Design a binder for this molecule. Structure first.
Ligand SMILES: [Cl-]
Ligand SMILES: [Cl-]
Lengths: 156, 156
């Protein structure tokens, strides 16, 4: 794929405007494609291990944010990046791989669940870094501020 | 949800750093949550009509970018915002609702498929605008530039 047809989409929206900007529609298109792009790149570090995005997200969330006893399914969702129909069965699934366990509830990593994340984490941190490499200091800070500001507007 | 635990996640990553920035990980988290937020807001204009995101995207793509005969399944994906397992059966599904049709192939809207988009479009353009309202000129332009630049880095 390329960004060679961005002007084609822009002019396509102009035709629709008989009687004045396509910025919003193009920005959301780009954000949508960015998400998919980021998705393919991030999964590379955990695909080989048989995990999908939703599974990975839960495990890493436990790894960085779960206290020794674990996180209540509520606070667990509040601390995870992904939330939605994608995580409709992530818990049950992970329990079945013995990567997490219960404590009634309360979820937390099992010795292997943690072993896996420890081994993958270096590769995740790398991809995470690489993926944002094209930008740079302050560019990444501003992106952070805007996404936060936009996201803040919708979280009301 | 709120952005009240962003510092908690940041400090959580710091603990992991025994021996130096969490920006990348927090920026991608924010981008991930932004996508879900945007997803819930955009669907409001088409949910009542029984369409999901993948169905809507195809229809709108045809509406703005399909010439009179239609788009070849290839160029159709190149002009659509969404691409992935979500659109694994969007075509077959839409044919079944009689919103699109064939031309052997080649896809295009049917009289109603177009009627629907015409009726929804005003509401979509509104949400699309609203959702980016919190920012402003140049803020939306810069967001566009960065997402494009990042996205450009991954589309290689
Ligand atoms: Cl679009
Ligand atoms: Cl994370």
């Amino acid at each position: 794929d390329t960004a060679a047809l961005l002007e084609r989409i822009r002019s396509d929206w102009a035709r629709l405007n008989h009687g004045p900007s396509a910025g919003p529609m193009l920005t959301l298109l780009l954000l949508e494609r960015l998400h998919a792009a980021l998705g393919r790149e991030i999964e590379r570090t955990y695909a080989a291990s048989g995990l999908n995005a939703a599974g990975w997200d839960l495990l890493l969330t436990l790894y960085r944010s779960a206290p020794p006893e674990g996180l209540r399914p509520t606070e667990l969702s509040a601390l995870a990046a992904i939330s939605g129909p994608s995580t409709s069965n992530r818990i049950v699934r992970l329990l079945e791989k013995g990567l997490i366990e219960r404590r009634e509830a309360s979820i937390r990593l099992t010795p292997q669940g943690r072993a896996l994340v420890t081994h993958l984490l270096p590769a995740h941190l790398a991809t995470t870094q690489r993926v944002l490499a094209p930008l740079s200091a302050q560019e990444q800070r501003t992106l952070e501020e805007l996404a936060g500001r936009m996201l803040a507007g919708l979280e009301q």
